[PDB]
Amino acid sequence: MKTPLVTREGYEKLKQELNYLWREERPEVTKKVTWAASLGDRSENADYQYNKKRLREIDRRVRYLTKCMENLKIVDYSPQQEGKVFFGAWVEIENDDGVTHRFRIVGYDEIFGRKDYISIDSPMARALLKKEVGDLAVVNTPAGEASWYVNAIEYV
């Protein structure tokens, strides 16, 4: 349920974050918690407490990111082996009443609505994983029963 593969692009980000976190926001957060204490009482002060949390949360991701950088795996792959869906592949799919929605498959670690918003350890990513330019893919979930048609695969 935890997958190491990560795009080259996505890698740059993870690095970027740890950078922004340790060099740019840790300074900001620690600085406020400072004044907070100088300013007064611990409980009634909401900013002393809020900032303590964001700093606990901040150093937390700092920890996670750091380890995922070393254990993550990059998938530098271009158009040569194409046709089949597997990774970093922008896929288009169809619904009978007309539901059309795009998506490229990339890892959960760093996915946001920015580059591609589908993780590989995901149902759709599983069904659609390796299927030709026009197969009939299925997906199941609690109330979710679903049929989809693979339209086009674009790797760029």
From Swiss-Prot:
Necessary for efficient RNA polymerase transcription elongation past template-encoded arresting sites. The arresting sites in DNA have the property of trapping a certain fraction of elongating RNA polymerases that pass through, resulting in locked ternary complexes. Cleavage of the nascent transcript by cleavage factors such as GreA or GreB allows the resumption of elongation from the new 3'terminus. GreB releases sequences of up to 9 nucleotides in length. Belongs to the GreA/GreB family. GreB subfamily. The keyword Electron transport does not apply. Keywords: DNA-binding, Transcription, Transcription regulation. Transmembrane segments: none annotated. It comes from the Bacteria. NCBIfam families: greB (TIGR01461), PRK01885.1 (NF002506). Pfam families: GreA_GreB, GreA_GreB_N. The gene is greB. Gene3D superfamilies: Transcription elongation factor, GreA/GreB, C-terminal domain, Transcription elongation factor, GreA/GreB, N-terminal domain. This is Transcription elongation factor GreB. One of its GO terms (biological process) is DNA-templated transcription elongation. GO terms for molecular function: DNA binding; RNA polymerase binding.
